[PDB]
Amino acid sequence: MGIQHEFDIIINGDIALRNLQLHKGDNYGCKLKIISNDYKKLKFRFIIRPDWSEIDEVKGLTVFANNYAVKVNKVDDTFYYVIYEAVIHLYNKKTEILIYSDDENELFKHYYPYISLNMISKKYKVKEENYSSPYIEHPLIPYRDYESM
């Protein structure tokens, strides 16, 4: 049993995408398909609980939306949790968001989950679990203070 981080993403304080971590490995990420007519923008909070048993530092996150670079802000950085935020603006009905620590060696193809969030029909679903076991919670139940938005 190698490196086991935990990785969650909260959207709009309403939707929690929990348990997104890779089953093992020093990386964490998610691919999102957003379908929308009405949302001008989505607020994201990306929560990492790092496994410090082997690492020297906690990898940060890169975010692209339809392959345009998105501003990412680190808002907490502690031993037990490292938290990032972004507010992503939607310019097309369909937007692919790539969130990751690293994007190499088929991580998106075989490892990171792929989740669809249809904001029109309000249908939130896992398209591919790959090497993770996502749990989509809606409405979100805040189990930690840093989960509520």
From Swiss-Prot:
Induction and repression of expression: Expressed in the early phase of the viral replicative cycle.
UniProt keyword annotation of Cell membrane present: no
Alphabetic keyword roster: Early protein, Host-virus interaction, Inhibition of host innate immune response by virus, Viral immunoevasion
One Pfam family from the record: Pox_C7_F8A
GO biological process, one term: symbiont-mediated suppression of host innate immune response
Coiled coil (UniProt feature): none
Primary role: Inhibits antiviral activity induced by type I interferons. Does not block signal transduction of IFN, but is important to counteract the host antiviral state induced by a pre-treatment with IFN.
Record-stated family: Belongs to the orthopoxvirus OPG027 family.
Name recorded for this polypeptide: Interferon antagonist OPG027
Lineage per the UniProt record: Viruses, Varidnaviria, Bamfordvirae, Nucleocytoviricota, Pokkesviricetes
Protein encoded by which gene: OPG027
